[PDB]
Amino acid sequence: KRSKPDIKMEPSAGRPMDYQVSITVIEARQLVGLNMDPVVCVEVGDDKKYTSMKESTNCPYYNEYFVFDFHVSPDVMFDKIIKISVIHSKNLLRSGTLVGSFKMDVGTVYSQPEHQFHHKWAILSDPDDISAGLKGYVKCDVAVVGKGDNIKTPHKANETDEDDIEGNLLLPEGVPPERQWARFYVKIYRAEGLPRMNTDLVDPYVQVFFAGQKGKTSVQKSSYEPLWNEQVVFTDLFPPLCKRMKVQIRDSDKVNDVAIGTHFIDLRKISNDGDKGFLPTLGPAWVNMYGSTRNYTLLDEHQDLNEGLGEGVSFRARLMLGLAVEILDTSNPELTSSTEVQVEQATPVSESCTGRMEEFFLFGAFLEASMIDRKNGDKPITFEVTIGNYGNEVDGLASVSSTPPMRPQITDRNYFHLPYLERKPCIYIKSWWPDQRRRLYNANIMDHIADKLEEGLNDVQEMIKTEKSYPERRLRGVLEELSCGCHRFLSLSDKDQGRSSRTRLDRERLKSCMRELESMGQQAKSLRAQVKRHTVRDKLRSCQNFLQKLRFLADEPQHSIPDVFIWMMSNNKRIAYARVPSKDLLFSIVEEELGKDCAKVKTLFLKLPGKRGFGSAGWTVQAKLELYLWLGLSKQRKDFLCGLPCGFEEVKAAQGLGLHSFPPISLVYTKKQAFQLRAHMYQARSLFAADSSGLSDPFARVFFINQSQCTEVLNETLCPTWDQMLVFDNLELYGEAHELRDDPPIIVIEIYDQDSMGKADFMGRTFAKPLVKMADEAYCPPRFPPQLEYYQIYRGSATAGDLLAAFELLQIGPSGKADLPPINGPVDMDRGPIMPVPVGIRPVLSKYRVEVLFWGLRDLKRVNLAQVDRPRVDIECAGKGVQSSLIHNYKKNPNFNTLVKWFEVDLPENELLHPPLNIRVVDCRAFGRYTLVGSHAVSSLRRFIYRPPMLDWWSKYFASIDTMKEQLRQHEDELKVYPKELESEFDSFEDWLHTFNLLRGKTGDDTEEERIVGRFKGSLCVYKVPLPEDVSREAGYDPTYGMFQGIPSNDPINVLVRIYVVRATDLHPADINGKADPYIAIKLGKTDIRDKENYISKQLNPVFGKSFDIEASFPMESMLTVAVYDWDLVGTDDLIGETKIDLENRFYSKHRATCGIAQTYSIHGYNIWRDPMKPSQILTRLCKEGKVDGPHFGPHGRVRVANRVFTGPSEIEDENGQRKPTDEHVALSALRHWEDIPRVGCRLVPEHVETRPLLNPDKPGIEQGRLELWVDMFPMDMPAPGTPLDISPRKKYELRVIVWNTDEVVLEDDDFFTGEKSSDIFVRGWLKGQQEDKQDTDVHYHSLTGEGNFNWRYLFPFDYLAAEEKIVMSKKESMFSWDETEYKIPARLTLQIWDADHFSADDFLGAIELDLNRFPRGAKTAKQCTMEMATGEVDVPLVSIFKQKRVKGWWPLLARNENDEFELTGKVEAELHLLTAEEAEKN
Ligand SMILES: [Ca+2]
């Protein structure tokens, strides 16, 4: 396949769109400064915000969130810098001292696989001083997201998880952590070809921006060809995290300096990292520079094109440039330690290093110039072609550049055309460019193999779309051809070694492309063998991992010949432009090295320059040229007319009369051939909506050469069936048969919405190439007759539907129109000249029946600000359909009194060609004035076409969360924990019930929720014929309810929902201080419960443990929403997150999604069964609903469902402790293995929590945080359930120690009165921190050898959990906080021996820090205590007091000496004891 051409008016480049960056700075560490007061400043481009001030902390904590929003182009967003700085003593009076700064850019943060860095530590270096060392690190999370992106957020963990600096640096892949300094020389030499800005002179100077620094050269006053010869040096951290250098020529002025042009050097194209890579280098070579139009205007609206914001519409300058980096040793005292940008004199380079200036030649032939836009074509028009400054005759051999102006004639009401016919104007341009053709040839072979590969991937994507047989063989052939072209590029590009015009970048880029493309060829040859159908899609992605990087090869940073520009001018006022690259036009002998646009006629769509080329002004095209272009050496000009169609005869200018090889000013064609286009137009689907009713009036105009016709208008449909051909009679073309069959001409098809007057709104356009046939060839299969194909219409950037067409070009023969095929006349003869699509091309139709289950309608909005009372649904498929029964009142019952009804239509035989079914709800008000409430049409029927087939419950939560963590890590009692929406694993519970998303309004462009006017609930069943009896008995049991038998009841039923909110983690902070105060809000219908009375305070990871009961009247009250809210002391409360969980499909699924089913039964304790019915009654109800025999019972260990038997345990315990027999365990096992039923077998949800991502309307597609919750449904017409689960969040302990004596404590104090050494020994110890566990003993004054006597008892009461061995407490973070915050640490004790004084603080002598779970055992005597029991010797075992409960021993306390080791500075005899809270009151 892939006969369609891919042309788009709006590419990805140029269009500005909304981005935002979110930067949070969690904790700063390892900073430097004496009594410093840090503030973290975050800068993105031209703005910056500061955090709060912290006083005298070395490790401050901020956790402050910043969001920067911009609406800019993607390329200029990727060039914005990100600066994280730390400032000491910032104030407005005096500038604070800079501690450290870190530079980064937006574009490489976007280059992450998650478009973000999670928990990464910025290296806060010193940009102000190269010789200075590291100034600290700052942990941060930085994310870049624009509109239209869906991303997954990783675990936003606290300090209790991995937070180490070195393994989580703020680096991309492959960057070395030390980031050695470098000098970046750019060497601006010369320039040529400047325009006029004084009216007419210019005062240029080159300013270069990189990494937030800038440097400008001197100004060469009054010179259009200036010579700067100056070099600008930067210094930054190699490798540069910023990936672009903005070099910009500027015209200096005394009031407002403006821009000449701007070129962006992408540093990835000129560099390679690693030990096999090479340092950044470029040039000395010429760089082309494009911008706005060269003629001066005082109010130029295209000024931003000179700044690089968009696409250059004309050539503006050529700049000689060089670049070279070097790594400098910053420890050398020979060089100054400065950092700022410097401008010095550069070394002059000869022109022979960039290639000799040499004369090139451009030839162009304007064959066709049609579809000129009407609002400009009242004047005669021209076509000015300029390459470089050559051909700029308007602004200022004799080269010609313009076609002769002559008036445009009428084609239709929307476009003119130009009557060239046989007189084709031509242009010839002499030019002088350097001899760097080999660079363009290498980039051209790169682009040629990349174009072949991209054509292969688009072809196999089309065979994926149309389900053609074995695309894996096409993939293997594509990879083999890619390897063959790879070896061709290996054997081709290396033969021009002898020239000395190669720069420093040429050899390095050729070698790097050699190595990388050898790796690509061997990787493609290895990937060819593993291509398989069932894993084809990932293989496609691997091919994309080739192709884009191949384009990364093809982009040349040192382009020699500038792009050619083809313009339009009406009375010498510029209208529209096209810009063709010159690597595609260069002529050469080898076919892969030959340009893809050289010596062939190509279609070329002009467009408005700059900002007028975007949006609604850029809908209609400005011209559709059929241009022949050739570019190359004048000694290679021997065959620059060979690719042209034959039959032409030259006419030259006055200077070239009688010459041999003078290029012609014009051509006259004599070999005219007549043709006819049969524009087959069968259908369209999913078109754009251009009326306020949500539908349109589509009629399509077909444009071919100069003729244009329109198919008839159909009314109030987005999927029309015109059933019409457009006969363009007696076309004329010029050429021969072999130059036209493989390259047919272009047909452009636009669709318009007819309105109440003569104007018509726009739908977009598509393009086509007709099936071409000659007189000598016959109408043989499989080429003829042409089959209808799908043509993708694009309304600019956004897609706007498909189109059904079978275009064919047919030449007339020597017998005239008698050699034309027999035209099938109109069966409906009332249409007259409207001739339908003939047979063979028209899809052969067959009888189909559509049976529609009309279940209900949900949340329809107002029509003309009036409420909807009595809906009805019309259904249209292939023009005919059935209408639903009326409902009586929407507010009390939004359901139809009968459900199943059918209709008979004709549909095509193959399912790929099916027209879309269109449902339309309309209000049936009085007096027959029915208006459109909603419409849903875009659907494929393939899914509907039938074919015959001490423990608590938290311990159970821990025993499941660790298993799901183990399974997640191995991929990269117990409940089945689900990590996402339950709908994603259980296909939104759409077994028979389907939700069709119901639309009214114009289709959105550059949301669907604003178009939402409700949704339809129901099902479709479309089938050809009644099948044999065993298959058709599904409908044969009850024709009243049709094929949808097995349906459950439709009448309203009363229900309670029981929502359990377990916990939540990774909350986005509602408050700006990185904290939140969460509480659950729940809404369902009229019910809204907000539990503000039982909030959790100062928590981003709430342990909730809450259960709520909500009344609901189904089917109206089936739209539950669960949200988390933040308490605010003043003002209004701010929402944190909100999730939607609908209950219609959950209740009415076969999967039993009302309540989960546990792993096993227990009638007491932590595994209590919350559902009121036993599982025996549960599968009794499921067997009665699903037409299943069973359940059957025998002994208590077996249960029979259908023809299968399952097993399980027999006895079960209650709270009294005595066993009882039951068979409900085996019933629950049958519920677990319910998938094995041969007819009604599907999956069932187990008892779960779901980790639903909470979304926000402000950030679509972005998870603010994950919420652990699960819902239960219990219909109240069955008996009510009991007490809900005790999921409420949580043992208290007493640690007591006694210090008996001390020995060998170091005598720190010399005696003031007698002189001997002594020590006032006393003890101190604490578990948690300062304000809670600080206690000390009495002082043993004046020790002689370290002996002391205390006999003092400590006591530490606390809370504790043994699941993670964590001591549990909540305390205020600061004295200014409102209330307490929860903290977790492991079991710690810190013991110290001090030296008391009567007048000041005590002197530190010794310390130990031990764990109650793994401390080494104590000595038996004081003298047995040695150094080995405290250090890291493995010979000393460990004792846990949680199993021992009594420890007596001697233990050494260790000073903090300067030798980084431990020294015996004291011994302590200690008794250590553990009690509970109840035992502590009497022990
Ligand atoms: Ca309209």
Ligand SMILES: [Ca+2]
């Ligand atoms: Ca209309």
Ligand SMILES: [Ca+2]
């Ligand atoms: Ca708040």
Ligand SMILES: [Ca+2]
């Ligand atoms: Ca708050």
Ligand SMILES: [Ca+2]
């Ligand atoms: Ca003392």
